[PDB]
Symmetry: C3
Subunit: 241 residues, 3 copies
C-alpha cells in the first residue's frame, strides 16, 4: 500500500484545537479509530456553525495508480443544508503530490437547526477493485444557524452575523452579483482577473466541463483520463476487452 | 536512496531567522555540513529559552521501506532539564508522506543554566542495515531559565514570565490539572472533546500502548508493524528464519 | 510520468487573491491552459510593484530521476530590471521532496516603468531527453517603480516607500552593509549567526561554489551530482561512452 488520506494541522486547529495531522488512511489501510467506524461516528459531533468547509489532504506516494469515485453527496435535510460540495471532480485519479480537497457544507440560512448528510467515496486499484471505501450508510451532521441578509446572498454565499454576504471564489460585492468570469469555473478551475478559467488536468472549455480522451472506452466504460480507464467486471485492459 | 530529513521554513524562522528549508538528509545521504559533524557541533549554540520544542520533517519518497529507532534520549543534566521527548514511537517505519516530529526539551524551571543532552537515532534498510545514524556521543545543549509559578505546573508544563502555566496537549487550567481524557494519549495520540485517544497506526487502547502483530517475530525479534519485522544478524526474512 | 510543478496556495493569495494550488505540470504533462502557451501569455499581466519574488514548488514523486537546466535568465530591459535570480543552482536534479524555488525579479529603482524578461528552463529524463520545456522565446513582464533611498541599498536591496532598505538574506542595517558571513552564500546556502554557509547537496566551501564528483564525466560532459551525469548525443551511460 501507498495511499495516505489525512487532515492538515492548520485545519485541525479550527475543528479540534490541537495543531497536528489527523491521519485517516495510512499505507493503504484505515487508521485504528476507523475500524469500529460506528463507535467513531458517536465520538464525532455536528459540524459547528463557524466551520463552513473542511480541508482533506490526500496522495498516492508509490508508483501505483489509485482511482477515487464520489458515489453519493446527498443532504438528508434539504430544507436546512444543501447537498455537500467538493472542489474536485467526482471521478478521477488520486494525485501523487499532496493535494487538499475542499468539502463545503452549504447551509441555506432560511432555517435554523442541525442537518444530516452522506459522504460516500471509493478508492480503487489499477485492476479496478475497491480497497478503501466509506462503510455502508455513513451519516454525518452539520449545525446551521438562521441568518438574514438584506436582498439575499447569491451563488452559494452565507450571511454573516455582521449582515455581510460571504462571497465564494469568482464572486464579490454586497449580494455576490458582481462576478469576474461570466460562467463560474467548475471541477477546481480558477478565474484570473481578465477572466476565463484555469482548467484542471483532464478538462477544457470556459467552465471546465468538456473532457478529452486519447483512448475511447468500450463496453459501457467511463473515461476520466486519456491514460487509464475503468472497466466493468469480466472485461480487463486499457480499452476494456 | 530516497530518504529526506529536514527542518521546515516556518520552524527555521524561529531558530535562525531565515525562512527556508534546512536539509539534513538528502537522497539517503547526509548534507555537506554534516560530514565534519564535530565542526558542525561547534557552529550550533544552546537551544534558546524561548524555543521549547523543535519540528523535524521526514519522508521516504521511494517504494523502499525505511525503519527508524531512537536508541538514547537522555538528559546529562537531569536537575535542570528532563529527558528530551518525541511525539513519535521510539521504534517504527518512516512515513512515505511528509510528517513532522516534535522534539520537546523539558526544562524543570527549578534551576537556571544550560543543560546538555543526547539524541541517538538510527535509520535502517529493508534488509536491516544501519545506513544513516547519529555519529558517536552527540551532545547538544539547551538554555533553561528559572521561573516560579504559584502552585506549580503539572504534566510537563513550563511557567511563563507572566506567571501562567503553558499547558501541553490534553491539559488546561491554572496548574494544568483540568484534563479532557483521563489517561494522557501516547505515541502521538490525540484526545477529542468527549474523550479517549485517536490512536496512531500500529497502536490501540485508551492510552495507545497495546500493539498488535499479524506475524509473530521469532528468535528474539521486536515487532512494530504487522507488515515488516527487525531480525538479528544471521537470521533473515519476514518471521526471522 | 511523475513530475509536478505548481504554485503554492500561500503565494497564490498574493498574486491572484484565491488561496489554491496553481498546477503547471501534472503527471509529467503541462496543464490544459499551457497548451496554447501564447494565449496564456496574454492572460498574464506584468508582475506588480508589490510582488518582488515568486515561489514555485516542484517534485519528482516516482522512482524516476529528473534533471533540470536553466538555459537563459536574461532581462531585456537592463536599465529598469536586473537579470532574474533563482535560489537553486542552474543545472541539477529535481528533488523527490516538495521544494520551493524563489524566482527573484530585481528592480534597480533608478528608473520607473515596466521591464520584460526571459525564463528558459528544460526538464530531462534519465536517458537525457528534453520532455518538458519553456516554449520558444518566452517573454514575461515586471512593473518597477522609481524609489530613492539616502545612501543607496547594497547587495540586491530594494528601497521601500518608507525610505528603508529591504535587505536580503545574510544582510542587515540601513544600507545593507552589515553582513553576517563575509562572502554571501550561493546556490541556496544559508549563513548561521557565527558565520559560514550551510552548503546545499553537491556543493562545498565558504560560498558553496566548489563541486565534487565521484565519477568524472568524459567527452565534454558536465557534472552536477556524483550519482548521475549528462551525456551528449551519440554517447550513453554513467561516464558517457
Ligand atoms: O481602496 S479601496 O477601499 O477602494 O479598496 C481598493 C482595492 O480594492 C481592490 C481589492 O481589494 S481587496 O479585495 O481587499 O484586496 O479591488 C476589489 O475591491 C473593489 C471595490 O473596493 S471596495 O473597497 O471593496 O468596495 C472592487 O471594485 S468593485 O467590484 O466594487 O467595483 C474590485 O472589483 S474589480 O477588480 O474592480 O472588478 C475588487 O477586486 S476583486 O474582485 O476583489 O478582485 C483593489 O483593486 S485590485 O487590486 O484591482 O483588485 C484595490 O486596490 S487598489 O490598489 O486601490 O486598486
Ligand atoms: O468566554 S470565555 O472567556 O469564557 O471563553 C469561552 C470559550 O472557552 C472555551 C475555549 O476557549 S479557547 O480555548 O480559547 O478557544 O472553552 C475552554 O475554556 C473554558 C474556560 O474559559 S476560560 O476563559 O478559559 O476560563 C474551559 O472551561 S473550564 O475548563 O475553565 O471550566 C473549557 O474546558 S471545557 O471544554 O469546558 O472542558 C475550555 O475548553 S478547552 O479545554 O480549551 O477545550 C470555549 O468552549 S469550547 O468551545 O467548548 O471549547 C468557549 O467558547 S464558547 O463559545 O463560549 O463556548
Ligand atoms: O531591542 S532592540 O530594538 O535593540 O532589538 C533587539 C533585537 O535585535 C536583534 C534581532 O532583532 S530582530 O531582527 O527583529 O529579531 O538583533 C538584530 O538587530 C540588532 C540591532 O537592533 S535594531 O533594533 O534592529 O537596531 C543588530 O545589531 S546591529 O546589527 O544593529 O548592530 C543585530 O545584528 S547582530 O546580530 O547583533 O550582528 C541583529 O541581528 S540580526 O542581524 O538581525 O540577526 C536581537 O539580537 S539577536 O537576537 O542576537 O539577533 C535582539 O534581541 S535581543 O533579545 O535584545 O538580543
Ligand atoms: C475525502 C472524502 C471522504 C471524506 C468525506 C466524508 C466526511 C465529510 C464530513 C467530515 C467532517 C465531519 C466529522 C467531524 C467534524 C468535526 O467537527 O469534528 C468534531 C470535533 C469538533 O470539535 P468540537 O467538539 O466542536 O470542539 C471544538 C472546540 N474544542 C472544545 C475542541 C476546543 O472534532 C473531532 O473531535 C474529531 C475530528 C477529526 C475526525 C474527522 C474525520 C471524520 C470523517 C472520516 C471520513 C473518512 C471516511 C471516508 C474516506 C474513506
Ligand atoms: C529526527 C531525530 C534526530 C534529530 C534529533 C537530534 C537533534 C536534536 C537537537 C537539535 C536542535 C539543536 C541544534 C541547534 C538548535 C539551534 O537553536 O540552532 C542554533 C542556531 C540558533 O540561532 P541563534 O544563534 O539562537 O540566533 C537566533 C537569532 N538570530 C541571531 C539568528 C537572528 O540555529 C542555527 O544556526 C543552526 C540550526 C540548524 C541546525 C539544526 C540541526 C542540528 C541537529 C542535527 C541532528 C541530525 C542528526 C540525527 C539524524 C541523523
Ligand atoms: C520554475 C522555473 C520555470 C518558471 C519560471 C518562468 C516564469 C517566471 C515568471 C512567472 C511570473 C509571471 C507570470 C504572471 C505573474 C502574475 O502576477 O500573474 C498575473 C496575475 C496577477 O494578478 P493581478 O492581475 O495583478 O490582480 C491581482 C489583484 N486581483 C485583482 C487579482 C485581486 O496572476 C494570474 O492571474 C495568473 C497567475 C498564475 C500563472 C503563473 C504561472 C505563469 C508562468 C509559467 C511558467 C512555466 C513554464 C516554465 C516551466 C515549464
Ligand atoms: C511546530 O512546532 C509547534 C510547537 O513549537 C507546534 O505547535 C506546531 O504544530 C509544529 N508544526 C507542525 C506542522 O506540527
Ligand atoms: C487531451 O487533453 C490532454 C490535456 O488534458 C492533452 O495533453 C492531449 O494532447 C489531448 N489529446 C487530444 C487528442 O486532444
Ligand atoms: C515565499 O516567498 C517569500 C518571499 O516573497 C519567502 O520569504 C518565503 O519563505 C517563500 N516560501 C517558502 C516556502 O519558501
Ligand atoms: C492489527 O492492527 C491493524 C491496525 O493497526 C489492523 O488493520 C489489523 O487487522 C489487526 N490484525 C489483527 C489480527 O487484529
Ligand atoms: C483550508 O480551508 C480554507 C477555507 O475554510 C481555504 O481558504 C484554504 O485555502 C484551505 N487550505 C488549503 C491548503 O487549501
Ligand atoms: C562528494 O561530495 C559528497 C557530498 O556532496 C560526499 O558525500 C562524497 O563522499 C564526496 N566524494 C568524495 C570523493 O569526496
Ligand atoms: C461510468 O462507469 C461505467 C462502469 C458505466 O456505469 C457508465 O455508464 C458510467 O458513466
Ligand atoms: C527488540 O530488538 C530485538 C533485536 C531484541 O533486542 C529485542 O529484545 C528488542 O526488544
Ligand atoms: C555542460 O554540458 C555539456 C554537454 C557541455 O556543453 C559542457 O561544456 C557544459 O559545461
Amino acid at each position: 500500500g501507498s495511499l495516505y488520506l489525512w487532515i492538515d494541522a492548520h485545519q485541525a486547529r479550527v475543528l479540534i484545537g490541537f495543531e497536528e495531522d489527523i491521519l485517516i488512511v495510512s499505507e493503504g489501510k484505515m487508521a485504528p479509530f476507523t475500524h469500529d467506524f460506528r463507535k467513531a461516528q458517536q465520538r464525532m459531533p455536528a459540524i459547528p456553525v463557524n466551520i463552513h468547509s473542511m480541508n482533506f489532504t490526500w496522495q498516492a506516494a508509490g508508483q501505483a495508480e489509485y482511482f477515487y469515485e464520489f458515489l453519493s453527496l446527498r443532504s438528508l435535510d434539504k430544507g436546512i443544508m444543501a447537498d455537500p460540495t467538493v472542489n474536485v471532480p467526482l471521478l478521477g485519479t488520486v494525485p501523487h503530490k499532496a493535494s487538499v480537497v475542499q468539502v463545503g457544507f452549504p447551509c441555506l440560512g432560511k432555517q435554523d437547526g442541525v442537518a444530516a448528510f452522506e459522504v460516500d467515496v471509493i478508492v480503487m486499484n489499477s485492476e479496478g477493485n475497491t480497497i478503501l471505501k466509506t462503510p455502508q450508510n455513513a451519516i454525518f451532521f452539520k449545525t446551521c444557524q438562521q441568518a438574514e441578509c438584506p436582498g439575499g446572498c447569491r451563488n452559494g454565499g452565507f450571511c454573516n452575523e455582521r449582515r455581510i454576504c460571504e462571497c465564494p471564489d469568482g464572486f464579490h460585492g454586497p449580494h455576490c452579483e458582481k462576478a469576474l468570469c461570466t460562467p463560474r469555473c467548475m471541477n477546481g478551475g480558477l478565474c484570473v482577473t481578465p477572466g476565463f478559467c484555469i482548467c484542471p488536468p483532464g478538462f477544457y472549455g470556459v467552465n471546465c466541463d468538456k473532457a478529452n480522451c486519447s483512448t475511447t472506452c468500450f463496453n459501457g466504460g467511463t473515461c476520466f483520463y486519456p491514460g487509464k480507464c475503468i472497466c466493468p467486471p469480466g472485461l480487463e485492459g486499457e480499452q476494456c476487452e
